[PDB]
Amino acid sequence: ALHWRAAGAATVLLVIVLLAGSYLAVLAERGAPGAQLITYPRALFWSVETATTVGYGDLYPVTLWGRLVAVVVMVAGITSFGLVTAALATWFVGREQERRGHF
Amino acid sequence: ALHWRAAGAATVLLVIVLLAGSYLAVLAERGAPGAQLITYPRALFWSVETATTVGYGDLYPVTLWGRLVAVVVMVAGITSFGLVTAALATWFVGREQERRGHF
């Protein structure tokens, strides 16, 4: 199943991006006066609300590499959601042409 | 219909998450000085703008369990939207191969 390979890998990729992104955000934001994304617990929640595109604004990067990490977290969460949605649609379609009599 | 089972259950799940999430957010935010997500009416609107990923930033949790509840509200609204979109696509596809002559 190709659609389950792409969705399954993207979700694994997303988890790696969320954890590494939380780590790399703190590493890139510290050293910049005024930054508030400087502790791992709340940086872990920031990566989730970034990947899900919620983006409250309570937490955000101010540096270049912090923003580059943010972009990666944005793209990873969006593409993973696009692949899973696509994989679900083909799963339902193939399931629907079955149950009738089409294999 | 499997795609209507998954979309129909997800929307029901979303309503449960929205109501319980509004309740659990207030319960988890009270006791934390500075929290503003501490009354049920506006916490009910916060769960909607969280599940829809709008996230104005007028309201957001500051505690651990408040943020954990927020994550659940984020994921519930996103996956429900992914299943309904998938269910619509298969519904249109099956409707399109009909009307021609394919059953």
Partner: antibody, heavy 118, light 106 residues
Framework: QVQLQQPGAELVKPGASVKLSCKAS????????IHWVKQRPGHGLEWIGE????????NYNEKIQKKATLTADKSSSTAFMQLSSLTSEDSAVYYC???????????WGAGTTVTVSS | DILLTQSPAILSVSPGERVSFSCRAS??????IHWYQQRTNGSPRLLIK???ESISGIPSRFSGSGSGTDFTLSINSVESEDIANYYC?????????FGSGTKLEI
């Protein structure tokens, strides 16, 4: 079981340098930050800089003059601070502290009494 | 940066009396304040992390409160071992800063 072990004291000639150490026992996570705090006799706590040994990146106090250079050795779990070009104004007690990346200094060292005199 | 002002410099109190130190920040820092104790010729010791939450090993005698720009460390019934220097530290913004300190005398 001192988690952060520092030498007792260090004597430095005016204008010379010294390499302070901070051997770390206990749990050593990849999210650990080692902070260095300067304290003059009869004075308060002053933040010098931080370093994450798992990555090797260090930050410093911009409001003061850069006298320190932070390094680390993951194989021996020991962070180092290089105080160069010392005057009498650099004579103080230098602590090292371990932060779990959650903001607070959970464990401190005994401090090293650095004296700059001829 | 964020300056932390501690008042008063020296705090006199009778034994068995509830005392309170004050830590105030230049700007709103939520609850990201931490309290430390330093006795004579000793190293700082964490008493309170994140304004109000306690630390294992530290007596229930110590308690903290406040949010925004006004923080308070309280001691129910001060005894002789409480005589030390008390500091507050913020972690809300980079860089971490310390308070000027408050000495306790009985």
């Amino acid at each position: 079981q001192v988690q952060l072990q520092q030498p007792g004291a260090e004597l430095v000639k005016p204008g010379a340098s010294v390499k302070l150490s901070c051997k770390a026992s206990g749990y050593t996570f990849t999210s650990d930050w080692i902070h260095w705090v300067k304290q003059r006799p009869g004075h308060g706590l002053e933040w010098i800089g931080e370093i994450i040994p798992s990555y090797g990146r260090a930050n410093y106090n911009e409001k003061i003059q850069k006298k320190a250079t932070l390094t680390a050795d993951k194989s021996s779990s020991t962070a180092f601070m290089q105080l160069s070009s010392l005057t009498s104004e650099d004579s103080a007690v230098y602590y090292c502290a371990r932060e779990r990346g959650d903001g607070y200094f959970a464990v401190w060292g005994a401090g090293t009494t650095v004296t700059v005199s001829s | 940066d964020i300056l932390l002002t501690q008042s008063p410099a020296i705090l006199s109190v009778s034994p068995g009396e509830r005392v309170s130190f004050s830590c105030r920040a230049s700007q709103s820092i939520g609850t990201d304040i931490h309290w430390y104790q330093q006795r004579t010729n000793g190293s700082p010791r964490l008493l309170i992390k994140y304004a109000s939450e306690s630390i294992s090993g530290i007596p229930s005698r110590f308690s903290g409160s406040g949010s925004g720009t006004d923080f308070t460390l309280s001691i129910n019934s001060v005894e002789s071992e409480d005589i030390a220097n008390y500091y507050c530290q913020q972690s809300n913004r980079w860089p971490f800063t310390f308070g000027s300190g408050t000495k306790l005398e009985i």
